[PDB]
Design a protein around this ligand. Sequence first.
Ligand SMILES: Nc1nc(=O)c2c([nH]1)NC[C@@H](CNc1ccc(C(=O)N[C@@H](CCC(=O)O)C(=O)O)cc1)N2C=O
Ligand SMILES: O=c1ccn([C@@H]2O[C@H](COP(=O)(O)O)[C@@H](O)[C@H]2O)c(=O)[nH]1
Length: 298
Amino acid sequence: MKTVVFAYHDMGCLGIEALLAAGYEISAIFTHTDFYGSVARLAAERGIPVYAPDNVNHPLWVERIAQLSPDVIFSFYYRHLIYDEILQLAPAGAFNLHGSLLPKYRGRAPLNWVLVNGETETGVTLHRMVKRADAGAIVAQLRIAIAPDDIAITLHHKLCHAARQLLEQTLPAIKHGNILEIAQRENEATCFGRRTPDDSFLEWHKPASVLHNMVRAVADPWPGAFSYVGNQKFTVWSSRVHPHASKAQPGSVISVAPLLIACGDGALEIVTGQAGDGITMQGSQLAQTLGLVQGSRL
Ligand SMILES: Nc1nc(=O)c2c([nH]1)NC[C@@H](CNc1ccc(C(=O)N[C@@H](CCC(=O)O)C(=O)O)cc1)N2C=O
Ligand SMILES: O=c1ccn([C@@H]2O[C@H](COP(=O)(O)O)[C@@H](O)[C@H]2O)c(=O)[nH]1
């Protein structure tokens, strides 16, 4: 079974590895220009031609892919929609690996959004690729738990592990044409967009648990959840929830050692953070750096 693969980052690398282990012949990999593994370096080491056009949806790339005669196409965290002109070239179709429990969390950054939203489970889905992103029939799915202390990077690794398992289990079935698919239930679908560093703003009126989830969702090496002291941005890199009710106004500094901020329900301890583009520091030092005192209002 011959394939053309669209791949990026760690999911891209493990998808390529899984295909090679399952005995697929990879004729070409399409990727993007740049902590993640490099699909291009993997392709190069494996002797596979690799290409990173900004937009693969060009007549000449369509023609080129056609000339490679793929049986099947895979996408493993390729970022750009691939037009029907390309997808229809492969007689056995096209499959994508998405990092959520479709039909929930279609779209961008499902790793981060499930954390933002306080989910206790997520998963990986392999589905047929169709014109609408993340919307085609499901062929395999694997559910995993999100632990209360998971952060983006730790959940990322768990999703990668799950993807490897799912692919190892499923790729042989595709190769042999055993491949039941079930349509997604559109009434159950949810979809999320690209996140910017700004979508990680901490709003202190929210429950401490919700703010904690935001901190986890974009913890290092993601860009971090943030607030301000006047013109001074600061990032909360790690936190802990103090569930006890405070009579303090949301955003009030309850204490500076440890740095504890009243929320809409409970309080949030800022365990580590940074002021602006300065270095990471413990919360008590951050408090001093920012000029906060007990009773300061954020
Ligand atoms: N045909 C096809 N189907 C897919 O499911 C699929 C591909 N291609 N290619 C790789 C990838 C692309 N996934 C996505 C996911 C979301 C958007 C999206 O919502 N785009 C918005 C907003 C701008 C943006 O985020 O790019 C839009 O209005 O198009 C696009 C592509 N993908 C499966 O992962
Ligand atoms: O919750 C998120 C998820 C991603 N990004 C940004 O989205 C881009 C895509 O990230 P990759 O998807 O991590 O490249 C990067 O600039 C990344 O920092 C955020 O700001 N917040």
